[PDB]
Amino acid sequence: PELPDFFEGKHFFLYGEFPGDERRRLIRYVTAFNGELEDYMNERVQFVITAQEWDPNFEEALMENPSLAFVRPRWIYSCNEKQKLLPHQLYGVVPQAHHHHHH
Amino acid sequence: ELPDFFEGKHFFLYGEFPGDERRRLIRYVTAFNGELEDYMNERVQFVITAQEWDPNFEEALMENPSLAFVRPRWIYSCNEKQKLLPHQLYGVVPQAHHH
């Protein structure tokens, strides 16, 4: 076998662009594991998935919805690879220092 | 990993569905790598409906003659058996007295 349900009750917003057909693949995994996709940044959103640099506007999103978590798409790939809900913190996205250096 | 037996197949959900059936159908079609269309356009190969044969279907066939009309049960059974079953077993057709 049956489809796993480890995303049950969790709401995702896919932020921005992803390479190739990766956006469709994210929709596929989120949906397959019973997650809920949101087409807008609304009160129900819990996870913002982004492959991009931190967006300063996320600060306004946080004013409306202080529970938001920002996460890399690798989190969803890994949940699929392991067939279980991994902690999003391991794939978190945070603002980086102005003029931060290469690491 | 996830079966991809709907890969390359385009689906349109036509009409109304009971309970949470629409979301379930979307879940399975998406999970098995099917493609869901917002309109019954030229890319659609499978029209899924819980409703009876409808004059709209006859009109759709005029320019998309290869369309297939199928019951939700088809997608549920593919899931149960984890494989692509023949849609012909679950087809939607006019009642015979209409012929």
Which CATH number belongs to the domain containing residue A32 in this structure? 3.40.50.10190
Burial of residue B24 (number of CB atoms within 10 Å: 0-12, 13-18, 19+): middle
Alpha helix positions (H), A3-98: 22-32, 58-64, 74-82
Experimental determination approach used: X-ray
Task: Give CA–CA dist B45/A54, Å, rounded.
Answer: 41
Q: Which two tokens stand for residue A52?
A: 């991009």
Collapsing DSSP to helix, strand or coil, A36 comes out as: strand
Give resolution, Å, one decimal. 1.9
- List the 43-102 stretch of A: residues with Cβ below 8 A of B: 80
Q: Does B33 touch chain A (CB under 8 A)?
A: yes
Q: Which two tokens stand for residue A9?
A: 């009750």
Does A31 contact B33 at a Cβ distance shorter than 8 Å? Answer: no
Collapsing DSSP to helix, strand or coil, A14 comes out as: strand
Pick the residue from chain A with its C-alpha nearest to B80.
A2
Give B-chain residues touching A31 at CB under 8 angstroms: 26-27, 30-31
Are the C-beta atoms of B21 and B43 separated by less than 8 Å? no
Strands A36-37 and A69-71 turn out to be: unpaired
Q: Which of A27, A31, A80 to mutate to test the interface with B (most CBs of B within 10 A)?
A: A31
Task: Give CA–CA dist A86/A93, Å, rounded.
Answer: 15
Are the C-beta atoms of B92 and B37 separated by less than 8 Å? no
Residues facing B10 on adjacent strands: B35
Q: Which of B4, B22, B30, B37 to mutate to test the interface with A (most CBs of A within 10 A)?
A: B30
Q: What is the DSSP letter of A100?
A: P
- Residue-range definition of the domain harbouring residue A14: 1-103
B15 closest CA partner among B99, B88, B92, B87? B92
Instruction: Please count the structural domains in chain B.
Output: 1
Q: Which two tokens stand for residue A56?
A: 């300063």
Give A-chain residues touching B31 at CB under 8 angstroms: 3, 28, 31-32
Q: Which two tokens stand for residue B31?
A: 């999970």
